[PDB]
Design a protein around this ligand. Structure first.
Ligand SMILES: [Ca+2]
Ligand SMILES: [Ca+2]
Ligand SMILES: [Ca+2]
Ligand SMILES: [Ca+2]
Ligand SMILES: [Ca+2]
Ligand SMILES: [Ca+2]
Ligand SMILES: [Ca+2]
Ligand SMILES: [Ca+2]
Ligand SMILES: [Ca+2]
Ligand SMILES: [Ca+2]
Lengths: 151, 150, 151
């Protein structure tokens, strides 16, 4: 009966935690986050070159935004629109020109390239940026774009 | 067995309670204010009424709607911190001279500054809260601190 | 049996919460917080004189950054570096010149003074600031420095 009283005690404590946490999830995402599925996009609010942006995300325990579906891309687009700043994606074709991959080396499972892209303009575009219209364009990694990580 | 798993679970819940409590303080610093079961959080920037209202609803909340002196003081704390008057959620856009909450219910509390609301120029249907906590009906097209409540 | 299944169910709920909380904690700390051990450093993003900075932290349920080990100092330095702004620590030698103490009155158990410090320049430097290189310098409390609290 004791273990029973203890189990019922935990049920209440857990119910409380779930309810309190549910509220704080909303508070946290406002105004720089976007939740899509099990993924959370969150912008740092400023721009940085690719390598620096990548470092920020990885050291934070996540990685640069990597939309893998129309839904994720649409969620990421909301942050880009909100900040009115094109953002860097995690993908590059730095290893093999013309072959874009995730930070793990895997090939793209989704893409939303603007017509004609990627075009490796000037023979020097190995990074990818997402516009406010949600379309993608390969861009020089040295350029500064909105830092958006995924967790 | 059960006794062993219940003790493990109890430890898990106690750890979560301590960790969540700490996390709450971190989250609220420096843009949020917890008052009762409500949480006011500022976006840190200004926007006109329509844009600010959309920002809050899209975030799963709504614009700051203080319904008591206690809530008003909490909200005012954020206003003082950012040094910027904020938009409240109430407007008399439907019926002039009658301010209401987004749902449509009449105000259950107000903290108007002397003489307000005065519909200056015949075009003030929105409400702003000053750093002194008092309210003033203001033009909805004006840009004020965005503060939502969750 | 009925209890066993109840414990099994609750534990799944709890471990799911543990996973959700872990994710939201990472999101929360990006880009203005740093966790080290059981301590969490979080910057307000702006500068304030010591007294105002101290009140902001205490009112938030914490206190000004008080690195007590090389590891904590390193974590704090990350925020100072990210914002590129020297930050105030919680320690002062206001009560007894030359003797820096934590808000509790307790003497320092760790220090990372830059060469020549603390020097009490002008005979009025009773506060402590941490540089982007992580080194400390006693600084006049009236100066404005990055506000970083620990929770
Ligand atoms: Ca947060
Ligand atoms: Ca190339
Ligand atoms: Ca290329
Ligand atoms: Ca291109
Ligand atoms: Ca009107
Ligand atoms: Ca009016
Ligand atoms: Ca007025
Ligand atoms: Ca002195
Ligand atoms: Ca001194
Ligand atoms: Ca000095």
């Amino acid at each position: 009966a004791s273990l029973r009283q203890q189990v019922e005690a935990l049920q209440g404590q857990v119910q409380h935690l779930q309810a309190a946490f549910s509220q704080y999830k909303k508070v946290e995402l406002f105004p720089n986050g976007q939740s899509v599925g099990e993924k959370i996009f969150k912008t740092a609010g400023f721009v940085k070159p690719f390598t620096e942006a990548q470092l920020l995300c990885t050291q934070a325990g996540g990685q640069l935004a990597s939309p893998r579906s129309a839904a994720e891309n649409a969620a990421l687009q909301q942050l880009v629109v909100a900040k009115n700043e094109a953002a860097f994606l995690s993908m590059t074709d730095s290893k093999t020109e013309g072959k874009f991959t995730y930070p793990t080396g895997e090939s793209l499972v989704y893409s939303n390239w603007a017509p004609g892209e990627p075009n490796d303009d000037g023979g020097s575009e190995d990074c990818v940026e997402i516009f406010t219209n949600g379309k993608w364009n390969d861009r020089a990694c040295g350029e500064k774009r909105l830092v958006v990580c995924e967790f």
